[PDB]
Amino acid sequence: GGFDYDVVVVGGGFAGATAARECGLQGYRTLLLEARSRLGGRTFTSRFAGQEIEFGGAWVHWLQPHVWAEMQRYGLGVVEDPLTNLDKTLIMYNDGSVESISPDEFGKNIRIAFEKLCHDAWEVFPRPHEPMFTERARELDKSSVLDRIKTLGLSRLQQAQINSYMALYAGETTDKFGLPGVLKLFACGGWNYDAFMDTETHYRIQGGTIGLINAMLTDSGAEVRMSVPVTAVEQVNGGVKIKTDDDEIITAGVVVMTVPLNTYKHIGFTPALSKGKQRFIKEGQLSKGAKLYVHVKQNLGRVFAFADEQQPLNWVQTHDYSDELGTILSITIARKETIDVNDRDAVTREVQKMFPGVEVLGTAAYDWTADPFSLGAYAAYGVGQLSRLKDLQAAEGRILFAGAETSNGWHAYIDGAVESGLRAGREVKQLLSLEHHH
Template sequence: MAASLALPMHHAQATETDVIVIGAGAAGLAAAHDLKAAGRKAIVLEARSRIGGRAFTDASLGPAYDAGAMFIHWAERNPWVQIARDLGIETPGESWGGGFRVFADGRPMTDADRQKRRGAFGQIDRRLETVDLTRRDLSVKELLGDLGPDMSQIASSGLLLSIGEESDRISTRDYQRLWAGDDLVVPSGYGNLVSRHGAGLDIRLNQPVSEIRWDGLDVAVTTPSGTLHANACIVTVPVGVLKAGAIRFTPALPARNRNALDGLGMGALTKIALRVEGDRFGIIPGTSFLEAGSPSRLMNFDLFPDDKDLVIAYCGGDHARELSAAGTEAARAHVTELLAQMIGPNIRKAVTGISFPAWWTDPFSRGSYSVCLPGREAARERLAEPIGGRIFIAGEATAGGGAMTVGGATLAGRAAAAKVARIKA
């Protein structure tokens, strides 16, 4: 029977499909493509009015920028290199023409302090090479423990801008296994690329799923438009959404999957984009500034990237959580003030707009990407264990060494589709 979600709830009849995929981000799209290629009928239910999830090219300020994912990480094995090539989309290497300047409380950092910073950053890699984690996991904060509070804080600050989380909440074992490699960029937008990859799939927008029932012979998935029944369901919503209980499982998730969710958190990497018009303040487009005076001010700025009238500020961890909770106007005032201290007061007049995709407070992401808590490094694999033989949790959080990335989400979506393909239609 053809699936339909057009009926209001009280008229909704049981409609059927083969597989329901929840979420139209990279993982959901990959799963749906593979199921389609295997001759299975899959419907993708997406809560937002757009596809792409945390890969989102935002053009609301005029010039577009990637508000979520920007880099095709570990390009040597990332499926998006080939997907882009097939679509005729360019993916050059990253090039920041304008250089990098570091500030402390609005003033250029002294050479001695910059030297100290470089020394501290090297410590994480050095310690990862020698630490013995065979008996027990450590948090990254513990890994850096005997460095002294000052150096440890500097070393940890890099993680706020990469993992988006405080070092006491990051498992060293999990951090150690994350894949590394070359980074490429997508000048036309990584988010745009992911969206284009949705072509040809049966995707239903504005369908926030509120319940998944798996106590019958099939899986019943409820949205405001009705209930849809399927043989199997792939759930790709972020772990932040699952942890918030936005989707009720009936019966409840098995203890192993729940326990896995407890072992994962969401980082809070956050970008704040300002439209800056009329003046470049003598700054070469593509320059990066880092305000590194104190953890509560730590913020990176990409100034006029690709010669666009934009400044993209980003930060992570608890500072980003506070800014997200404070809202757009507070974020604008904070970021503009930091810029004014580094560049001069005239920047205030040149800021004409703000876009603040606060992933931490966004109900459909609840954070930037998954972070494994110390001692809980089995959580990613455990979360992906099949539920009742018919429900499969996928998404970046389940991607092992590829976790936290678009490429990892895609591989996880494909892995879930392969498991579903073994179930009879």
């Protein structure tokens, strides 16, 4: 009806890229606005110490249906990051003490702890993609992961392991981490430890995440604008007026918001969003971590380590290793407040506090929690949030909402973002059609 564009997609992560592809291919005049000067959002492929790395999400699996189907469409295969026959497996406790565990007794103890925590996933989530199907799922949304970890009677090692694991998934202390979200994720993977674990940091996309992002946006035909942050959305005249941070207005029939939930405080809405959505906007989601790579010139082979929630290096892994190269450690930090990643002294310190005979040569980090356009990492639900997710998914007039947080399945993954983007495309068609179906 005379607007600048039929649809504006705010955000150039996987959710926005997918929503723009769906829309563009319908023939809609489509615009995507990205605040950063790069695409990918919470995925970001860079380079460090001579090789391609990934500062955010990177690992996918065929059991993740939405992203997998997109890899078929665009013909992208997988690249395997094996870690068979590990050389060292460590557990660092809340006290800072570091125990080298035998690798095979390591995995078996985490399996016991994991399978005990997810003992009722089959029953609670018969339909992982309808999380609130069973009533017990809704009751369990009054408990936290720690509430249950305390009722499982695990050994000392097993408790530290699962809590590190769960603290990483939460990017927070396990007492704030909603319990159902974890069970549903396990269900998505087939209610089976071996299957779920096979999706963990195992397979990467040929050509990186940015390759799939580009393949979607190229396919879409949409206009794409970088370094254009959106500061306000106003519903008016049968459409929307979108305001950028340099005060220029763009009109559209509809808007698809795909920005991370934690970044919504930076955007004004007229009229106001529903109270349910507002509650979500002020609560946010939990994760407040960072990503960190380190370069050691002391070959360490295949390595893994947990650290409980009171140490910084909660999830450590070997990205590569050569007698020449030394080792490059891939590390995910659950809470950035436990360590300043952009300080080479504290990093070298804490790294050596786990691998004492190490010389720290080079480091590269990404502080997702300090970045104004993520203000966090992967989606992590608090207690009682999953039960209210409909409030976050609901359309508000001619404003639709997507993003991994708003997905039903793999909400902490690329796949969730893709899923939410397919939904946004469908909701856009309903709003701009000849026969409607809201």
